[PDB]
Amino acid sequence: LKDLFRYIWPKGNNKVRIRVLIALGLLISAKILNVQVPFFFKQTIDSMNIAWDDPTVALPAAIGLTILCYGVARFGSVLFGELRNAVFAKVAQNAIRTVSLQTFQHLMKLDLGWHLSRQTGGLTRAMDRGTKGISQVLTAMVFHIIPISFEISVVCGILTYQFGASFAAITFSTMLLYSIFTIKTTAWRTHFRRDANKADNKAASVALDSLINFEAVKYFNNEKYLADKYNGSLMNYRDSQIKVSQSLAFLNSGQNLIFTTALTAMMYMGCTGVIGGNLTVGDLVLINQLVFQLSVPLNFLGSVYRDLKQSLIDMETLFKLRKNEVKIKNAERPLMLPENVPYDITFENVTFGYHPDRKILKNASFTIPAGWKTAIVGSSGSGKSTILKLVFRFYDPESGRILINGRDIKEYDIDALRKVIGVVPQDTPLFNDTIWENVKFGRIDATDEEVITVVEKAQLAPLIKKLPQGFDTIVGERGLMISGGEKQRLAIARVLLKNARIMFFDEATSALDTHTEQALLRTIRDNFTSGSRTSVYIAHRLRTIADADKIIVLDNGRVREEGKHLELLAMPGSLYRELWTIQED
Amino acid sequence: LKDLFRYIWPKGNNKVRIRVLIALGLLISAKILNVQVPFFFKQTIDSMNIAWDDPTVALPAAIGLTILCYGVARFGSVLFGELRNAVFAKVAQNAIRTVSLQTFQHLMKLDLGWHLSRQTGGLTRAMDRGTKGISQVLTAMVFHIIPISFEISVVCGILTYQFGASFAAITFSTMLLYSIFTIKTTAWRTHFRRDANKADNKAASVALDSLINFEAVKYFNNEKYLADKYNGSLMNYRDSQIKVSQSLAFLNSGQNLIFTTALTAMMYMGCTGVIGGNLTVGDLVLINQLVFQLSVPLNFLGSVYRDLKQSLIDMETLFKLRKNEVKIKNAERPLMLPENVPYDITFENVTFGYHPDRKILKNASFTIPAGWKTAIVGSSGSGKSTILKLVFRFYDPESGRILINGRDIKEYDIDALRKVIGVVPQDTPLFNDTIWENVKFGRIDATDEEVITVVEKAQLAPLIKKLPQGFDTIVGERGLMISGGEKQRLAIARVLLKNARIMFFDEATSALDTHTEQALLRTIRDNFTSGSRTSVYIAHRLRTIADADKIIVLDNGRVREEGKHLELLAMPGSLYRELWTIQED
Ligand SMILES: CCCCCCCC/C=C/CCCCCCCC(=O)O[C@H](COC(=O)CCCCCCCCCCC)COP(=O)(O)OCCN
Ligand SMILES: CCCCCCCC/C=C/CCCCCCCC(=O)O[C@H](COC(=O)CCCCCCCCCCC)COP(=O)(O)OCCN
Ligand SMILES: Nc1ncnc2c1ncn2[C@@H]1O[C@H](COP(=O)(O)OP(=O)(O)NP(=O)(O)O)[C@@H](O)[C@H]1O
Ligand SMILES: Nc1ncnc2c1ncn2[C@@H]1O[C@H](COP(=O)(O)OP(=O)(O)NP(=O)(O)O)[C@@H](O)[C@H]1O
Ligand SMILES: [Mg+2]
Ligand SMILES: [Mg+2]
C-alpha cells in the first residue's frame, strides 16, 4: 500500500495532488452532511410531537424548512460522494495507465532467463489481476473504508459529547470487541484464502500449458489426464472458497451481533435517560439512526468487499514485476559503435552457464572476422546459439570478454549494439497479424517497395500469389497457420529488411528444400557487397557452408577446429571430416 | 442469464434445488425481519413518548422486551443474510467448477482451425473473466438485486395499506421516474462501457503477442513501437473508464435525488397527517426508516456493482466457448480398428483446403502401405503436413476419402484412431515441467524403466548425465530452456513410448547433426520388427529416406511421382532426380 501512494501522491505534478485533496474535501463534507441529516430528523420529530388542536391547520413553515434541509443534506451527501468517485476515478485511471506502461517497459527491459523461466500467460494474468486489484483497492479505500472510519470517529465524538460518557464507554468497548473478533477470525480465514489462491493459480497453469500444446495433447490422447488434473485443482479451489465464504458469514454475523448489542444498549441508556427527564424521543431517534446508517454500510461493504486482500496480493505481485532486477544494463559512460566499418567479434577466454551449476562454454576463445562469412558447427547441445545470444547480449559471461572492434560489448549501448546485429533464430514465433506487418517488423520506417523487394528475394512471391488475401493472410497463433519453411523465409525477410551488418543465421534452412535453400543463399550472398556484412551461419547441412571463409567447429563448449573447408576435410583426425563423411554417404 | 439458471437449477440432482430453495427462504425471512424491525422501533418510540412523573422510575418490562425484539430482528436479518450467502456459495462454487470443466473438455474436443485462429491467452482470459463474472452475477443477484426487489415490493405494499393511497401514488410515480431515468442513462453509458472493453482487450492482445515474441521483439529493436501501441490502447481505455465513471456518478446522483424527493414528500404527507390527528410521530419514524434502510443499500449496491454488465458479457463469451460447433465427431455407429494387423492408409480422390478460398490438395490419390517405410517429399507449401493432419483427423476433406484397411476413417472412433497413430510434429512445444513428465506424456501408464530405455534409444542419456538435475530439469516456456535437437529427441522418445503402429515423422531430424541423426534412425528402424509398423517420413534431407520402400513426391497439392529411390533417380524428367542433384553438389 506504499507504491500505490507513490502513484496517487507523487513528487511533482501538483495537479493530481490537488485532485486528491479535492476528493478528500468532498469525502469530508459528504460524511458531515450524512451525520447532520439525523439532527434535522430529530428536530422535525420533536417539533411535530406537540399537541395540535385543529386538524385543518396548515404545516408551519419552520418544519417544512427543516424537512427540506433534511432532504437537501441527504442529497448533498450522496452528491459529494459521487463527485468524489468521479474525481478519484480520473486519478486512479491515470495511475493504472502509468503502472501498466511502466511494467510493460520493464518486462521488455528484463533479461531472457527471466522470461523463459516463466509462462507468459502467468505474466498477463498477474498484470490483469493487478490492475483490477488497484481499481478495487482504491474504490474501497476511498469509498467504503476511509469514509466509514471518519464517520465512526465523528459518531463516537457526538455520542460522547452530547449524551454523556456512558455511550462513550459503550462505543469504545464495542470497537474493542469488534477489533479483537475480526483479528482472531481473519487469522483463521487467511488459510482458506491462501489455499484457494494457490489452487486457482495451479488450475490456470494447467489449462494454459494444455491449450498451448493442444496438438501434443491430442497427438497422444491425454485429454482425460489433464482434465482430471484440472478437476482436482478446481475441487480444491471449490472447497477452499466454500470454507472462506462460510467463515466470512460467521465473521459478519458476529460483527453485527456485537454492533446490535451496542445498539440495543444505546437504546436502553437513552430510554432510561428519557425516564430521567433529560433526553427526549428525538434523542433516541437520533442515536439509533446515526448508529444504523453507520452500521448497514459497514456490514454491506464488509460482505461485498469479500475480495480485497487477494487484490493486495495481486497488486503486490504486479509491483514486484515492476521492481525486479535488470542484469543487462548499459554502463555509466556508454560508447557508440563506429560509423562505417565492418565489425569483428572476438571471444576471449569466455566461460558461461545459463545456471551456476553447469558450464556450457569452457574457456572458449575465437575470432569472427569482418567482411567474411564464418560458419559455426558442432554436436547438438554444444553451445552454438549460446554464442548467438551472448553477442546479442541477452546474457553476460561469468569470466571472459566479448570484443567488437577491440572494445568489450559492455562499453556499448545495448540498444546501439542490438541495432547492427540481425538474427534469424532457431524458433521463429511470429505474430497473429498479416504477413505484411510481420515482414515490416524489421524496419517499421520502411517504404512498402522495400518490403516487396525483400519478399521477392526471400522466395515468397509465389506463396503471395497463391494465397487469395496476399499480404493480408493472418498467420494465426505464433505462425501456425502457415508452413515451417514460410516462417523461416519471413524471418529471413525481416532480417534482410533490417539491413544490418552482423547477420546471424541460426539454422535458417532447416525446413526449406534444397532448391529453395540454394536459391535463397544465392540471393543473399549476392545482395550485399563482398566486404560489408559479417555473416555467421549455424549449420547442420554442411553443404550450405562449404563456401565459408572460416569454419568454427566446437564440441562440449570448446572450440576444437578452425579453418576453411578443405583445410579441415583434407586433414586426418578432424571432426568436420567425420561429419562430412557421414553426410556424403 | 439462462444457462446460469440451467446450472443452478438443473434437471435431476434435487440436492442443489433444495439448497436453492432454502437460500430463497432465508432471503425471504431476512427481508421480513428487516422490514419488521422499524415497527418495533415505532412501538418503543410511541411508548416512551408518555409523560414520566418520576425520574427514578425503572424501565417498564414491555419496552425493554420490544427493544430486545428490535435488536433480535436486526440480528436475525443479518444472520439469515449470511446463512443465505454461505448456502448459495456452496451452490455457485459447484456450478463454476462444473462449467469450467465442461468448457475445458469442449476446448479439448474442438478442431484445430478453431485453436490456431485464436490466441490461447485470449481463451484463458475469457475463462477467468467468465468465472469471476459468474461469481459476481450470483453474488449480486442473490444478495443485492432480488432481496432489494422483494423489500421494495413489501415496502410499497405496507405504505399503501397502512398510510393510505397517497403514499402509494408517490411510491409508484417514484418507481416510474427512477426506471425512466435509469433506462435513458444506461442507453448512454453502454457506449463508453463498450469502448473500454474493446480497448482493454486490444491492449491485452498487444501485451501478450509481444511478450510471447520477446526474442523477436529485442532482435529487431521494436520495444518502443509496441509500448506506444499499448499506451494508445491504454489511453483509450482510460478516457472511456473515466467517462463511464462520471456517467455513473450522474446516474446515482439523479437516482438519489428522485428517491430523496420521494422521501421528503412522504415526510410532509405524514406530517400533515399527524396534523390531522390520524398518524403519530411513530408513523413518521417508521416511514422514514423503512425508506432510508431501503435506500442506502440500493445506492451503495448500485455504486459498488459498477461492473455487472461486463460480467454478463464475460459469462456469455464463456458459454459461447461452451456452445461452439464440433466439426470432427464420431459417427452414430463407430467401429473400432482391427486387433493385430499392420495398417494401410489410402487417399482416394481427396481435395482439401484449410479455408474455402484455397485448395492445398487438388485431387490427391495414393497408398501408404502396411509394414513398409514410405517417405513423402516435395516443395514447401506443397501439402505434406496437411496429409499428416488429415489422417489424424484434425480436419476432414471436402471431397474424397481416407481409408484405413478399406474403411473410411469416419466410420471409426476418433479416439481409437488417434491411439494407433504416433506423430513427431514439425513444431514441438513441450510443457514447463521436468523432462520426466514430458517423456512420460506418451504412455502415462508406463513403468519408469521404459521411459529410461526409450530415453537411451533417443540418444538422450549423455544430456541426462551432463545436466546436474537429470530427469528433473525444467524446460521452461514450451521447451525454450533446452536445445532444438533435444526437443526433437524428446518428441521421438514420446513417440517410441506410445509404441504405436503408424508412425509419422514430420521432419524429426531437422535440428540434429548427421551423427546423431543416423544413430537415431538406426536405433529406430532396429527397434520394431520389419513388418509391424507403418512409417511415413516427411523429409527434406533426402539422404535419410534413401532406404525407403516407397517415395511419394508431391507438388502443388498433387502426387507427381511414386516409387523407390533408384526407380526415380535413374529416370529422366524426375523431380526427385533434380532434388538429389542439387543435394549432391
Ligand atoms: C482515517 C481518518 C481518521 C480521521 C479522524 C478525524 C475525525 C475526528 C472526530 C471528530 C469529532 C467530532 C465531534 C463533533 C462534536 C459536535 C457534536 C454536535 O453536537 O454537533 C451537532 C452536529 O454537528 C455535526 O454535524 C458534527 C459533525 C462533525 C463536525 C466536524 C468533524 C471534524 C472535521 C475534521 C476534518 C478532517 C450540532 O447539532 P446541535 O444539536 O445543534 O449541537 C448543539 C451543540 N453545539
Ligand atoms: C423478484 C421477486 C418479486 C416478488 C414480490 C413479492 C412481494 C409482494 C409484496 C407483498 C406485500 C406485503 C404487504 C404487507 C402488508 C402488511 C402490512 C402490515 O401492517 O404489517 C405489519 C408488519 O408486517 C410485516 O412485517 C410485513 C412484511 C411482509 C409480509 C409478507 C410478505 C410477503 C411474503 C411473500 C413470500 C414470497 C404488521 O404491523 P402492525 O402495525 O401490527 O400492523 C397491523 C395490521 N395488521
Ligand atoms: N490454418 C492454415 N490456414 C491456411 N493455410 C494453411 C494453414 N495451415 C497451413 N496452411 C497453408 O497450407 C499450405 C501447405 O501447408 P503445409 O501442409 O504445412 O506445407 P508443408 O509440407 O508442411 N511445408 P514444410 O513443413 O515447410 O516442409 C501452405 O500454403 C500453408 O501455408
Ligand atoms: N535457459 C537454459 N537453461 C539451461 N540450459 C539451457 C538453457 N538454454 C539452453 N540450454 C542448454 O544449454 C546447452 C546448449 O544449448 P544451445 O546453445 O541451444 O545448443 P545448440 O547449439 O543451439 N543445439 P542445436 O540448436 O540443436 O543445434 C544445452 O545443454 C541446452 O540444453
Ligand atoms: Mg540452437
Ligand atoms: Mg510441415
mmCIF file of C-alpha atoms and ligand atoms in Angstrom, chain A residues 463 467 480-486 511, chain B residues 116 354-355 358 360 379-386 389 395 426 506-507 540, ligand 3:
data_model
loop_
_atom_site.group_PDB
_atom_site.id
_atom_site.type_symbol
_atom_site.label_atom_id
_atom_site.label_comp_id
_atom_site.label_asym_id
_atom_site.label_seq_id
_atom_site.Cartn_x
_atom_site.Cartn_y
_atom_site.Cartn_z
ATOM 1 C CA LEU A 463 3.101 -18.013 -51.988
ATOM 2 C CA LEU A 467 -2.942 -17.038 -51.346
ATOM 3 C CA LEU A 480 0.976 -21.933 -37.025
ATOM 4 C CA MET A 481 -1.399 -21.017 -39.877
ATOM 5 C CA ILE A 482 1.422 -21.337 -42.427
ATOM 6 C CA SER A 483 4.257 -23.723 -43.210
ATOM 7 C CA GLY A 484 7.532 -24.055 -41.347
ATOM 8 C CA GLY A 485 9.594 -23.035 -44.336
ATOM 9 C CA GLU A 486 7.443 -19.954 -44.850
ATOM 10 C CA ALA A 511 12.675 -26.580 -43.184
ATOM 11 C CA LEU B 116 -4.953 -21.733 -34.471
ATOM 12 C CA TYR B 354 -7.922 -25.068 -44.713
ATOM 13 C CA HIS B 355 -10.161 -22.250 -45.952
ATOM 14 C CA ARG B 358 -7.787 -22.138 -51.484
ATOM 15 C CA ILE B 360 -3.961 -27.239 -50.841
ATOM 16 C CA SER B 379 8.415 -28.392 -52.392
ATOM 17 C CA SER B 380 7.498 -26.296 -49.382
ATOM 18 C CA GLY B 381 3.885 -25.250 -49.042
ATOM 19 C CA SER B 382 3.044 -28.377 -51.039
ATOM 20 C CA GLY B 383 0.742 -30.175 -48.601
ATOM 21 C CA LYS B 384 2.766 -32.737 -46.646
ATOM 22 C CA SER B 385 1.869 -31.963 -43.036
ATOM 23 C CA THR B 386 -1.661 -31.416 -44.343
ATOM 24 C CA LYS B 389 -3.216 -33.792 -40.075
ATOM 25 C CA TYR B 395 -9.673 -31.687 -40.456
ATOM 26 C CA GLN B 426 7.250 -30.059 -37.092
ATOM 27 C CA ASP B 506 7.335 -34.599 -39.779
ATOM 28 C CA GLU B 507 10.993 -33.589 -40.065
ATOM 29 C CA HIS B 540 13.990 -32.630 -46.706
HETATM 30 N N1 LIG C 3 -4.542 -22.929 -40.817
HETATM 31 C C1 LIG C 3 -3.988 -22.769 -42.170
HETATM 32 N N2 LIG C 3 -4.721 -21.911 -42.831
HETATM 33 C C2 LIG C 3 -4.404 -21.599 -44.119
HETATM 34 N N3 LIG C 3 -3.344 -22.169 -44.711
HETATM 35 C C3 LIG C 3 -2.598 -23.042 -44.036
HETATM 36 C C4 LIG C 3 -2.904 -23.356 -42.769
HETATM 37 N N4 LIG C 3 -2.015 -24.238 -42.334
HETATM 38 C C5 LIG C 3 -1.161 -24.481 -43.311
HETATM 39 N N5 LIG C 3 -1.537 -23.732 -44.354
HETATM 40 C C6 LIG C 3 -1.117 -23.468 -45.727
HETATM 41 O O1 LIG C 3 -1.380 -24.515 -46.482
HETATM 42 C C7 LIG C 3 -0.103 -24.756 -47.458
HETATM 43 C C8 LIG C 3 0.560 -26.064 -47.115
HETATM 44 O O2 LIG C 3 0.747 -26.160 -45.678
HETATM 45 P P1 LIG C 3 1.732 -27.401 -45.110
HETATM 46 O O3 LIG C 3 0.988 -28.696 -45.209
HETATM 47 O O4 LIG C 3 2.111 -27.137 -43.683
HETATM 48 O O5 LIG C 3 3.090 -27.485 -46.038
HETATM 49 P P2 LIG C 3 4.434 -28.339 -45.589
HETATM 50 O O6 LIG C 3 4.545 -29.567 -46.425
HETATM 51 O O7 LIG C 3 4.314 -28.720 -44.135
HETATM 52 N N6 LIG C 3 5.838 -27.379 -45.804
HETATM 53 P P3 LIG C 3 7.227 -27.667 -44.804
HETATM 54 O O8 LIG C 3 6.770 -28.208 -43.482
HETATM 55 O O9 LIG C 3 7.962 -26.373 -44.600
HETATM 56 O O10 LIG C 3 8.146 -28.668 -45.477
HETATM 57 C C9 LIG C 3 0.730 -23.770 -47.252
HETATM 58 O O11 LIG C 3 0.483 -22.693 -48.209
HETATM 59 C C10 LIG C 3 0.407 -23.290 -45.820
HETATM 60 O O12 LIG C 3 0.756 -22.008 -45.682
#
